[PDB]
Short mmCIF file of C-alpha atoms (C1' of nucleotides) and ligand atoms in Angstrom, two decimals:
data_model
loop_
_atom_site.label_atom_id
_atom_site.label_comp_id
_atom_site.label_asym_id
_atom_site.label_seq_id
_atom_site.Cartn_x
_atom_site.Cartn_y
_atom_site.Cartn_z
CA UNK R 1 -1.90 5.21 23.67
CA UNK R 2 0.58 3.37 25.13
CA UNK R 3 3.02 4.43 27.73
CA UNK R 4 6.89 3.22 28.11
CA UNK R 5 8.03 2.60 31.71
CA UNK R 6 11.78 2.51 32.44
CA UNK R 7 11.87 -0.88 32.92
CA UNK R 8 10.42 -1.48 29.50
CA UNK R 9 13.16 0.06 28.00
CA UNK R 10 15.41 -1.69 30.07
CA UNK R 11 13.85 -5.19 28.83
CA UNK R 12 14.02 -3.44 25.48
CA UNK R 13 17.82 -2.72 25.83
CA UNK R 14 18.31 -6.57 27.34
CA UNK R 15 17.00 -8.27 23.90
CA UNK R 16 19.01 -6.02 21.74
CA UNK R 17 21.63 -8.81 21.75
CA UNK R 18 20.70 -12.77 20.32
CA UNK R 19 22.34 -14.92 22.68
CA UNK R 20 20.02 -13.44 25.97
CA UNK R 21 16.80 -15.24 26.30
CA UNK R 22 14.54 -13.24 29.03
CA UNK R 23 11.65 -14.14 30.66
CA UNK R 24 9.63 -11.20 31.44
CA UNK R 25 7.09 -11.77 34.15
CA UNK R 26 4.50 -9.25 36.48
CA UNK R 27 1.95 -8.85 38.55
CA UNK R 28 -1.51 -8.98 36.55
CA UNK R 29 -1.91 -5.85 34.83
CA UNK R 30 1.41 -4.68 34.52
CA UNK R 31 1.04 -4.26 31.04
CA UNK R 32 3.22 -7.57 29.69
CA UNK R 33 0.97 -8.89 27.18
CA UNK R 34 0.79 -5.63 26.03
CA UNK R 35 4.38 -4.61 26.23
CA UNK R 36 4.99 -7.73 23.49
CA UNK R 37 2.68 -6.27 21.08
CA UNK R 38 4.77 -3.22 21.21
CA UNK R 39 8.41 -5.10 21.07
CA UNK R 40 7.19 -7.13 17.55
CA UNK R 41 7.17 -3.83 15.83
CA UNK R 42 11.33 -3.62 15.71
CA UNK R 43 13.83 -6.02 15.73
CA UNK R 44 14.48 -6.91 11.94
CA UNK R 45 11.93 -8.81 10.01
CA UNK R 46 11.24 -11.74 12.05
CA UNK R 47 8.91 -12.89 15.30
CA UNK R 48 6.66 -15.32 16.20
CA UNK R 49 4.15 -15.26 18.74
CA UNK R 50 2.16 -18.42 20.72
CA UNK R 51 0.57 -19.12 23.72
CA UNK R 52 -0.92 -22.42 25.51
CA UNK R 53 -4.21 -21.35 25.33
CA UNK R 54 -5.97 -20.41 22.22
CA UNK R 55 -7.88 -17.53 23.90
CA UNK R 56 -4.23 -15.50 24.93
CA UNK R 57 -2.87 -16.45 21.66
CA UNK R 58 -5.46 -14.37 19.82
CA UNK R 59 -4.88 -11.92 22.63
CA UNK R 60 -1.08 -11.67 22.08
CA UNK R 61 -2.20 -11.97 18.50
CA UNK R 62 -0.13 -15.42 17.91
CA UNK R 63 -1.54 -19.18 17.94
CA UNK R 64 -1.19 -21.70 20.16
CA UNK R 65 1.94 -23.86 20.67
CA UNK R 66 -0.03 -27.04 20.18
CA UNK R 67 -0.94 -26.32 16.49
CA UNK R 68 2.41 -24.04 15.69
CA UNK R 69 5.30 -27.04 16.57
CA UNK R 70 2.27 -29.87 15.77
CA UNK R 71 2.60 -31.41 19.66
CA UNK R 72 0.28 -33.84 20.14
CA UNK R 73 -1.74 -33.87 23.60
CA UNK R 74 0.11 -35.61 26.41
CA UNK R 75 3.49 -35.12 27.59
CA UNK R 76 6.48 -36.08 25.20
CA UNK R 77 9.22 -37.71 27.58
CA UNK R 78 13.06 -38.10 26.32
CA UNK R 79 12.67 -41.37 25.51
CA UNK R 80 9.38 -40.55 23.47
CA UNK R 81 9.19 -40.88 19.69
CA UNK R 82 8.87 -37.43 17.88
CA UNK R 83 5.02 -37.97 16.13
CA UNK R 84 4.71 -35.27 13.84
CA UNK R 85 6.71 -34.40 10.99
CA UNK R 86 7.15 -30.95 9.44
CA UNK R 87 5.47 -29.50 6.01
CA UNK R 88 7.79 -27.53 3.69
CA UNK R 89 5.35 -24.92 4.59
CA UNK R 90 6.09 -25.23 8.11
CA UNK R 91 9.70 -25.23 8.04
CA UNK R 92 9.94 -21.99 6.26
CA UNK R 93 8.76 -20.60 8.96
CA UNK R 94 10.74 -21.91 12.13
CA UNK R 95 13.84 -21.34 9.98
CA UNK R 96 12.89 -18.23 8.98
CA UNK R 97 11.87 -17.26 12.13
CA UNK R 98 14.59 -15.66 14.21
CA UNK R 99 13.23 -14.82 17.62
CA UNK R 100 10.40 -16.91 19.46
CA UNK R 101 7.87 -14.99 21.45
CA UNK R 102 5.44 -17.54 24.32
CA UNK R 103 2.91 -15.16 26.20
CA UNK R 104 1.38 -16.31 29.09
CA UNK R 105 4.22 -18.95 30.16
CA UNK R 106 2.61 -19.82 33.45
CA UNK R 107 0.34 -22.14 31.65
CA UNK R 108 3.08 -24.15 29.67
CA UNK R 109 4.05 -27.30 30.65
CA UNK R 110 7.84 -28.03 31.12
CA UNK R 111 7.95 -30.84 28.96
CA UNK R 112 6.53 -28.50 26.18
CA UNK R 113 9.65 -26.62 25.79
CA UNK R 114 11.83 -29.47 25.24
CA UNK R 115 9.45 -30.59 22.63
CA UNK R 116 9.80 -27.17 21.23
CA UNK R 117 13.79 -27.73 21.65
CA UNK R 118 13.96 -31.33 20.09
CA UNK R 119 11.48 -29.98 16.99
CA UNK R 120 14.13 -26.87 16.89
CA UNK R 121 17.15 -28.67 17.14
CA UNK R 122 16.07 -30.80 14.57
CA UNK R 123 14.52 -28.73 11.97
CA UNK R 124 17.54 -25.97 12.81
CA UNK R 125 20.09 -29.01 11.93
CA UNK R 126 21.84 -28.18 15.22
CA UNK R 127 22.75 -28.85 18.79
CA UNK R 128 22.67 -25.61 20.49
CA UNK R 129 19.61 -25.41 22.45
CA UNK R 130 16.48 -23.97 20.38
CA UNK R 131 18.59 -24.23 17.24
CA UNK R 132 19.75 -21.09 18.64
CA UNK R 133 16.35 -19.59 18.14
CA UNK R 134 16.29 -16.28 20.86
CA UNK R 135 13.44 -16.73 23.44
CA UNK R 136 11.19 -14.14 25.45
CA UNK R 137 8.70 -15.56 27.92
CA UNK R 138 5.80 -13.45 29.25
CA UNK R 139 3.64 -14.74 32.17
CA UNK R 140 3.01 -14.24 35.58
CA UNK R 141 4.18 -17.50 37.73
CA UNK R 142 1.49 -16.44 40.54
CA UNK R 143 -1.79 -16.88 38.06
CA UNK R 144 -1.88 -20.45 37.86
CA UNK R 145 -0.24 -23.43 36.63
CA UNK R 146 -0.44 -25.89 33.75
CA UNK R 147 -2.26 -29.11 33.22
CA UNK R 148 -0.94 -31.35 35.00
CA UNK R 149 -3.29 -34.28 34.89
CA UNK R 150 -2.70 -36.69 37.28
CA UNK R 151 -1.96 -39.58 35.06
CA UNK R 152 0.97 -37.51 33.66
CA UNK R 153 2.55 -35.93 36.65
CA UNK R 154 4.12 -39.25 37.60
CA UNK R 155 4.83 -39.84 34.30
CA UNK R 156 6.67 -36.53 34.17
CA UNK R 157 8.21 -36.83 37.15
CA UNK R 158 10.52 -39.32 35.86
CA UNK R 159 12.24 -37.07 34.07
CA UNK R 160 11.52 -34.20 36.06
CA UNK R 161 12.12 -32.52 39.07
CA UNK R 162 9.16 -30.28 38.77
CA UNK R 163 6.12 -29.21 36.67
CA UNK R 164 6.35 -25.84 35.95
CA UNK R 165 7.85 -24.00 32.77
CA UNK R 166 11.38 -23.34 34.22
CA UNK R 167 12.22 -27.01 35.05
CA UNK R 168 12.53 -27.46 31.66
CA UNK R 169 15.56 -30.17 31.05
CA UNK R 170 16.72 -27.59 27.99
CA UNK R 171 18.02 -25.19 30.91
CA UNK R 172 20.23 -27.73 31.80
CA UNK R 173 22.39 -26.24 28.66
CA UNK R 174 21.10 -22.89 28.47
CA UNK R 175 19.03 -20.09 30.48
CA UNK R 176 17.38 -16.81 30.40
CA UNK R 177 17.08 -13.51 32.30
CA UNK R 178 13.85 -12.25 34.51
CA UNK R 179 12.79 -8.78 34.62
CA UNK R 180 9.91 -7.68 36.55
CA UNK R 181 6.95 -4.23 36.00
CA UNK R 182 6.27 -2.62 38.89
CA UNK R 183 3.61 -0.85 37.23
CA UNK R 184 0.07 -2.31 36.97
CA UNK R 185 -2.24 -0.62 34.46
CA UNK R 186 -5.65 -2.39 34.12
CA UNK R 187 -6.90 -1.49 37.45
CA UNK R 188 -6.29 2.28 38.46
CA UNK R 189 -7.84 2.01 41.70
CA UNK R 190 -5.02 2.21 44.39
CA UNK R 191 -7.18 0.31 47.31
CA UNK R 192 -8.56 -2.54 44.91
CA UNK R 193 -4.92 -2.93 43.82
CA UNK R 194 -4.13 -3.91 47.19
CA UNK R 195 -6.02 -6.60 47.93
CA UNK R 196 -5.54 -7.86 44.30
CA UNK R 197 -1.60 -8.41 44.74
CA UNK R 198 -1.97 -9.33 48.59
CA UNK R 199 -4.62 -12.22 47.17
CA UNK R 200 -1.41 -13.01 44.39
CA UNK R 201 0.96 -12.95 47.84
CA UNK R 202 -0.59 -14.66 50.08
CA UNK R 203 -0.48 -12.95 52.38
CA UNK R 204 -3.84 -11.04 53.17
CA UNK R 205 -6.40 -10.32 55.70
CA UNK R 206 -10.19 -10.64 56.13
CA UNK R 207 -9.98 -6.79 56.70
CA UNK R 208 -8.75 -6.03 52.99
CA UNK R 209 -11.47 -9.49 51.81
CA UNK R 210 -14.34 -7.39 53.57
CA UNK R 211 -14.18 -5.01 50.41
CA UNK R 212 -15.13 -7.67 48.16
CA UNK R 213 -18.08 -8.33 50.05
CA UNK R 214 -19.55 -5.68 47.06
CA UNK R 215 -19.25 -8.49 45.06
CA UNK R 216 -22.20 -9.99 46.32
CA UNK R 217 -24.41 -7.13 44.80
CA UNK R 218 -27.31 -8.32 42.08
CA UNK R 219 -27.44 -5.53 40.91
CA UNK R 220 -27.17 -4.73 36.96
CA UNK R 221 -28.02 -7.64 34.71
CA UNK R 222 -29.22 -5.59 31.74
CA UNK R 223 -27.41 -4.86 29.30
CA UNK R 224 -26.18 -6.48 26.06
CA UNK R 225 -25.19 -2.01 25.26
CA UNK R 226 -21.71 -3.22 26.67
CA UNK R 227 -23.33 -6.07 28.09
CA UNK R 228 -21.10 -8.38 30.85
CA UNK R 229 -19.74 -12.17 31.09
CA UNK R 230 -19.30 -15.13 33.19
CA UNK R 231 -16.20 -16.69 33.94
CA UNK R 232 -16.28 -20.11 36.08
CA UNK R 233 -13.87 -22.45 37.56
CA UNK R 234 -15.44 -25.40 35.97
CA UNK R 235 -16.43 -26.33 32.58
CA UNK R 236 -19.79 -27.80 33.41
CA UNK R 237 -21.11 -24.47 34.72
CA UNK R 238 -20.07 -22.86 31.55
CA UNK R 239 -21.62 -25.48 30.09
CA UNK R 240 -24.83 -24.64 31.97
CA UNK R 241 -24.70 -21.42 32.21
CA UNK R 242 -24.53 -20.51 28.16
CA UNK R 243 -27.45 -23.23 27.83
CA UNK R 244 -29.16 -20.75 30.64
CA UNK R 245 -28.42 -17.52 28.72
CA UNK R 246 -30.42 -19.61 25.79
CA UNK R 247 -33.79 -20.03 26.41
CA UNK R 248 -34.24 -22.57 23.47
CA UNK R 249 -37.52 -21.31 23.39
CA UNK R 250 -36.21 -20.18 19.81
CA UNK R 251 -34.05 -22.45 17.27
CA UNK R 252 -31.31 -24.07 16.05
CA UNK R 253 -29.63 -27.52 16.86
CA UNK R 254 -26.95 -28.35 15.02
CA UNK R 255 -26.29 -32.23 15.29
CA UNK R 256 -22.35 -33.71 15.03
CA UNK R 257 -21.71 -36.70 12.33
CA UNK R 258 -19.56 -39.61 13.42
CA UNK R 259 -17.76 -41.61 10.85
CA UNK R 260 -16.14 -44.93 12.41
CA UNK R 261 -15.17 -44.95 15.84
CA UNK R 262 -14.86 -41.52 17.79
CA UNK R 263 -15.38 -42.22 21.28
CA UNK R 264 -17.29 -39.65 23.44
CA UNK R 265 -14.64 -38.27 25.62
CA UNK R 266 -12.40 -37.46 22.86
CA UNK R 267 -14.63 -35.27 20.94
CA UNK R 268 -13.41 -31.45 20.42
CA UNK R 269 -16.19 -30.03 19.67
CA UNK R 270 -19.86 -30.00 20.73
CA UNK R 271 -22.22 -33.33 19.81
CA UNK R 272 -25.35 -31.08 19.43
CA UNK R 273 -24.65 -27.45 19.07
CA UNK R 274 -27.56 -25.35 20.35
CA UNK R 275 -27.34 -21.86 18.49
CA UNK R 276 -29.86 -18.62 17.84
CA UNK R 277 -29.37 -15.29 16.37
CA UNK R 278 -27.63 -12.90 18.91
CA UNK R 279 -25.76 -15.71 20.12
CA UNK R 280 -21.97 -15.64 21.72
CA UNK R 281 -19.81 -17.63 19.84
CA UNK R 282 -15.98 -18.97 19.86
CA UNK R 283 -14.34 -20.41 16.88
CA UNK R 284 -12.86 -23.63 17.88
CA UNK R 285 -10.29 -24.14 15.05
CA UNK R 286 -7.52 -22.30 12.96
CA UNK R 287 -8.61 -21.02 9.09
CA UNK R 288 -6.05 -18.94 8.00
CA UNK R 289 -8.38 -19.19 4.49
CA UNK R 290 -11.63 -18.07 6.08
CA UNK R 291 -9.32 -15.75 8.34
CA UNK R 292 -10.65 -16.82 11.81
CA UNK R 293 -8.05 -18.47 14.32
CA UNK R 294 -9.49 -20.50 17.42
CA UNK R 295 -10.16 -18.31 20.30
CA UNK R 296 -11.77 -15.60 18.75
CA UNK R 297 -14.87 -14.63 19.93
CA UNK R 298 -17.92 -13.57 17.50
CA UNK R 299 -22.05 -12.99 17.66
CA UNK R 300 -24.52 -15.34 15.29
CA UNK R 301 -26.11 -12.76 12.37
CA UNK R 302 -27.26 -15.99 10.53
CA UNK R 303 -28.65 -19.54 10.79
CA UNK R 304 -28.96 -21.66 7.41
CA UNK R 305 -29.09 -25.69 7.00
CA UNK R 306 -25.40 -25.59 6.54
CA UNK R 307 -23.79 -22.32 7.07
CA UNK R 308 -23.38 -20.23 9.96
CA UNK R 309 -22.95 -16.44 9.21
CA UNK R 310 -21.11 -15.17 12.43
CA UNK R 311 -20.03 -11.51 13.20
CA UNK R 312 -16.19 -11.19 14.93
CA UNK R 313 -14.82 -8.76 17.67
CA UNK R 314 -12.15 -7.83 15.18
CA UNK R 315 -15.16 -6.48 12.78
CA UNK R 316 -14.74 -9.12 10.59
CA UNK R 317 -18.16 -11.25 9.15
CA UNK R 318 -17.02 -14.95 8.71
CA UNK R 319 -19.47 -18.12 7.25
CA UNK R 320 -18.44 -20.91 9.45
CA UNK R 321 -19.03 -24.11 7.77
CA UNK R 322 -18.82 -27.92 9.45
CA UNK R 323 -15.08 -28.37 10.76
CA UNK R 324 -14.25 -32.41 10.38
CA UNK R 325 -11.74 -33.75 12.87
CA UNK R 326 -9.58 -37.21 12.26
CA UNK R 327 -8.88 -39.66 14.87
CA UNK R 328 -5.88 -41.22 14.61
CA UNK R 329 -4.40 -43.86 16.81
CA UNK R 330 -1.64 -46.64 16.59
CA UNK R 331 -2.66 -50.34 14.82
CA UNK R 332 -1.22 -53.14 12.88
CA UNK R 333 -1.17 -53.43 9.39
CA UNK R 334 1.08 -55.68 7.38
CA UNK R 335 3.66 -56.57 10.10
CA UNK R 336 4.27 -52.76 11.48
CA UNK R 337 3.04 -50.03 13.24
CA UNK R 338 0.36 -47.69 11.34
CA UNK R 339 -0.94 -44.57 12.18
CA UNK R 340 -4.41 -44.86 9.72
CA UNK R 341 -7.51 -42.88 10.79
CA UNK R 342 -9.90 -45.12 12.88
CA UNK R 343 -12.90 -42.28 12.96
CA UNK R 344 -14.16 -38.74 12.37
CA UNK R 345 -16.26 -36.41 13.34
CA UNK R 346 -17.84 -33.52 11.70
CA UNK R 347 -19.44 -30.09 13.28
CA UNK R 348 -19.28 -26.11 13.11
CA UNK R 349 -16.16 -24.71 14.66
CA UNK R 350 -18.33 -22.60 17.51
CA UNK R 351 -19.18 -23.21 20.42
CA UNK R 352 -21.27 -20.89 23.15
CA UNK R 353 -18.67 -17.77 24.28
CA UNK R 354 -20.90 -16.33 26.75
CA UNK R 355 -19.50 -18.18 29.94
CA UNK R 356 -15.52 -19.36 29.98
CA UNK R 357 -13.25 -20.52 31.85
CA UNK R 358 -10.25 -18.58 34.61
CA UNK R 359 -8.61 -20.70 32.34
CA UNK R 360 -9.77 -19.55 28.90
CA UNK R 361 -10.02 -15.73 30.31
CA UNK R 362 -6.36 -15.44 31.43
CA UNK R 363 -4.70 -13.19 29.38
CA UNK R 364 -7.93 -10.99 28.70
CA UNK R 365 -9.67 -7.37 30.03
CA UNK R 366 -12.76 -6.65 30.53
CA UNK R 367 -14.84 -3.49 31.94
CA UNK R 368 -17.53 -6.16 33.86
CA UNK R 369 -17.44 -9.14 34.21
CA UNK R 370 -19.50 -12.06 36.49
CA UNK R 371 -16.84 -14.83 38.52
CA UNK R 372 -18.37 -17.72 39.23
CA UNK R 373 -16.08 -19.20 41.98
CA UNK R 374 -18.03 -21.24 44.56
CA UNK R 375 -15.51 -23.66 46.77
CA UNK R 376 -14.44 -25.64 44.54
CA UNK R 377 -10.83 -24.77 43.01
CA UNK R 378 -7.17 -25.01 41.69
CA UNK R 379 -4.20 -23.10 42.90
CA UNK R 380 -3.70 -19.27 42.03
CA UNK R 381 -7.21 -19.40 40.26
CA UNK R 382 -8.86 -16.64 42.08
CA UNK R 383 -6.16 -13.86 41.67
CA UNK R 384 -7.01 -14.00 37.76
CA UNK R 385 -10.75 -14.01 37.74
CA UNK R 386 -10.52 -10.65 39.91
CA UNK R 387 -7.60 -9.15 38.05
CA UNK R 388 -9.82 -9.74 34.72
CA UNK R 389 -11.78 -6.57 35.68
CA UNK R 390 -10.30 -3.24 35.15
CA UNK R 391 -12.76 -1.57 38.06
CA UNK R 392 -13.96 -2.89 41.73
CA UNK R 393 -17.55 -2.28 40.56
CA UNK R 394 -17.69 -3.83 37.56
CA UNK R 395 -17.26 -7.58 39.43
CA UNK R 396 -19.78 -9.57 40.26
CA UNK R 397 -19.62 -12.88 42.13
CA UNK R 398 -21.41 -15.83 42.91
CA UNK R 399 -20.31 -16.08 46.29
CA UNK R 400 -18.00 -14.48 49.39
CA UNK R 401 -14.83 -14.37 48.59
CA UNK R 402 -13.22 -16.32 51.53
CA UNK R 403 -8.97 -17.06 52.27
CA UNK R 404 -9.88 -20.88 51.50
CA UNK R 405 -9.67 -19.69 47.45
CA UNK R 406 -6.23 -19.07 48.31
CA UNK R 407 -4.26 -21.86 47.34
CA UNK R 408 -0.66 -21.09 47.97
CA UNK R 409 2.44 -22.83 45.76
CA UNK R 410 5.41 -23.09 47.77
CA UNK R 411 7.99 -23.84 44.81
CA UNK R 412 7.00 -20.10 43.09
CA UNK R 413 8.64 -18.89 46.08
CA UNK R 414 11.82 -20.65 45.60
CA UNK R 415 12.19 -19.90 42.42
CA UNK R 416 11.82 -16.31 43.22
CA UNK R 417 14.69 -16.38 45.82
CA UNK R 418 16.99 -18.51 43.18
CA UNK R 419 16.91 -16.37 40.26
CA UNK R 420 17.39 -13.26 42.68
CA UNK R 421 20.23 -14.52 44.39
CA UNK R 422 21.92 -14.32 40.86
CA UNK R 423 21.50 -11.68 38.75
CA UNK R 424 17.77 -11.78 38.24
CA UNK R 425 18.97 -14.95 36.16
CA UNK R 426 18.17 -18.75 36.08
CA UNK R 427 19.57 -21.84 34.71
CA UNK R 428 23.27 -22.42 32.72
CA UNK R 429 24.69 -19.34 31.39
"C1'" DT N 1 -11.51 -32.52 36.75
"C1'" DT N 2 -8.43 -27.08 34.42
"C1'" DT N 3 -5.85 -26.99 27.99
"C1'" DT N 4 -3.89 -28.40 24.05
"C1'" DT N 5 -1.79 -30.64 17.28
"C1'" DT N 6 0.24 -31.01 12.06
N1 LIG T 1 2.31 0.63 28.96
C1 LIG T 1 0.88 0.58 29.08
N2 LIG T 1 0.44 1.82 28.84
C2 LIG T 1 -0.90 2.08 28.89
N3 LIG T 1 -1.78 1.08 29.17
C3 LIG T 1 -1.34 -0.16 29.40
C4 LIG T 1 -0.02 -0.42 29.36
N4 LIG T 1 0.16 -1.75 29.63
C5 LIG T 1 -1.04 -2.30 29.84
N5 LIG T 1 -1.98 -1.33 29.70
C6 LIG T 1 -3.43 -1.52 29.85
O1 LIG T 1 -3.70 -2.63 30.97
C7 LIG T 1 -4.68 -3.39 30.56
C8 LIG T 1 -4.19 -4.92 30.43
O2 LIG T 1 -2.97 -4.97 29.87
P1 LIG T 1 -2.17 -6.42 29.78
O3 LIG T 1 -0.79 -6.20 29.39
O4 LIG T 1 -2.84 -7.31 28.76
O5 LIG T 1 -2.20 -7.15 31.26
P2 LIG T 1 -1.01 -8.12 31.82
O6 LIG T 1 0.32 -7.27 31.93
O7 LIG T 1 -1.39 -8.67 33.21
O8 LIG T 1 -0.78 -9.30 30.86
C9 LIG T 1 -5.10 -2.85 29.19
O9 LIG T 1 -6.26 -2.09 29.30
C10 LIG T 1 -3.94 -1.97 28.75
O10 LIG T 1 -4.45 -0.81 27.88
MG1 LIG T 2 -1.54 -11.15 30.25
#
DNA sequence: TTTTTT
């Protein structure tokens, strides 16, 4: 199936030594996120793969880094206490592990990988960078960014001089290699390619955006036979949206529990989940037990008082039962600092797949899909939600696709001249 | 106003 362009070998050839971390990066398409599926399949008896997002873990066919290294949401500064410890389990692994594998790297915070470094280090029992653990990035730094909250870029900024992947203070002492494919793969159609990669540039003109105009067409809703999905900017219309696609003219609500205190905003999962049979579903948790790993995407067979009977991609028929999530914050007992559970909540691990999130979809391929992108944005978001599709026809959009969805980042084109101007390397070698 | 733990 698979084909092996010369500059895969040539990233092939790169890794065949441990000390050379490489970052291997592409225009959307170009067949990275494949090209790591192929690469696990060699080098000794070790990998690991992870991505930020659940969604391209299962895609890359890892987890996420969140639930791998146990980092706890927000970012972890220098001066920040390491949280979570370690199971026997877990350290097995990481030591075992001799080669580290993050897909999708556009999406990872900065501060990440020097949580990933400190939790290394440490569980290595060494000062080398990693614990000496060889890295391979894949991503594409023109997609889009992290998250980046607000409250946390100042925090971040402290300690950093920017807030993407590669300003990472652990390439201070080390660094890595970037290799680029020319080749793109999921769109074969040499005019659509065009305007994809001059939307990922830049630099484009309302001649090339007047063959989107297509987009606008109604035409095909029907049918589930190979059916079609939405993909918005904005949570709330997926909310709405897979709500719409319901008519609740049907059945089932299932209702969350609250033990304690849980407050609203910091709920995972859904407070009333709305399901019927036929119904697109994600699985918002890992069971390596069960088998399913959050992002996965499935179809309801069955609705019972408290099982869910659910029907994966992969083939695979899982019976979802109620997921319960702990809150834990900081208190007092005794004199000292505690970390003791102040609520939970309890609900099935699913929540509606049929509209997603740029977000979410990054990573993924689809034969049609429906982009919801009115204005309303976030840099490099556009070039994904077209690049999702592998044909010009197959898109459907909401709205015109105008230049003010192009927002450019400035400091993606310094990086490209600095690497470039050495070696096609970056940081301390 | 977008994601993500043991
Ligand atoms: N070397 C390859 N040979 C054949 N098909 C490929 C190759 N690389 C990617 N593809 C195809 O391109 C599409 C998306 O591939 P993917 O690697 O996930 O995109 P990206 O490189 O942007 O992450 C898939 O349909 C895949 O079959
Ligand atoms: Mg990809």
């Amino acid at each position: 199936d698979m084909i092996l362009t010369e500059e895969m070998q040539k990233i092939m050839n790169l890794i065949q030594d441990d000390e050379n971390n490489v970052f291997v990066t592409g225009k959307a398409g170009s067949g990275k996120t494949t090209f790591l599926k192929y690469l696990i399949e060699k080098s000794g008896k070790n990998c690991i793969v992870a991505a930020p997002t659940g969604i391209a873990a299962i895609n890359a066919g890892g987890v996420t880094l969140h639930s791998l290294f146990g980092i706890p949401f927000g970012p972890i500064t220098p001066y920040d206490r390491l949280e979570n410890k370690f199971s026997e389990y877990k350290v097995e692994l990481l030591l075992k592990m001799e080669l580290l594998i993050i897909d999708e790297i556009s999406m990872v915070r900065p501060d990440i990988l020097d949580t990933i470094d400190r939790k290394l280090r440490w569980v290595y029992e060494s000062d080398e960078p990693f614990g000496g653990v060889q890295v391979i990035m894949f991503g594409d730094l023109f997609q889009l960014p992290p998250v980046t909250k607000k409250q946390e870029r100042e925090i971040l900024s402290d300690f950093y001089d920017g807030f993407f992947f590669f300003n990472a203070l652990v390439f201070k002492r080390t660094g890595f290699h970037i290799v680029e494919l020319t080749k793109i793969f999921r769109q074969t159609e040499p005019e659509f390619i065009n305007v994809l990669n001059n939307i990922r540039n830049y630099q484009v003109t309302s001649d090339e955006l007047d063959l989107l105009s297509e987009l606008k067409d109604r035409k095909i809703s029907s049918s589930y036979d190979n059916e079609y999905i939405h993909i918005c900017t904005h949570k709330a219309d997926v909310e709405k949206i897979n709500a719409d696609k319901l008519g609740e003219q049907e059945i089932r609500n299932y209702d969350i529990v609250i033990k304690d205190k849980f407050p609203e905003s910091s709920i995972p999962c859904d407070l009333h989940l709305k399901l019927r049979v036929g119904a697109r579903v994600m699985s918002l948790v890992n069971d390596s037990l069960k088998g399913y790993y959050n992002g996965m995407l499935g179809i309801v067979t069955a609705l019972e008082d408290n099982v869910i009977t659910v029907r994966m991609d992969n083939g695979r028929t899982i019976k979802f039962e109620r997921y319960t999530w702990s809150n834990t914050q900081y208190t007092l007992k005794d004199n000292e600092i505690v970390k003791e559970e102040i609520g939970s909540c309890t609900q099935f691990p699913l929540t509606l797949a049929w509209a997603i999130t740029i977000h979410k979809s990054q990573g993924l391929t689809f034969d049609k899909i429906i982009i919801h992108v009115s204005h309303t944005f976030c840099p490099g978001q556009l070039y994904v939600a077209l690049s999702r599709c592998r044909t010009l026809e197959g898109i459907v959009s909401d709205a015109f696709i105008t230049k003010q969805m192009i927002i450019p980042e400035y400091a993606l084109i310094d990086f490209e001249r600095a690497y470039k101007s050495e070696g096609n390397y970056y940081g301390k070698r």
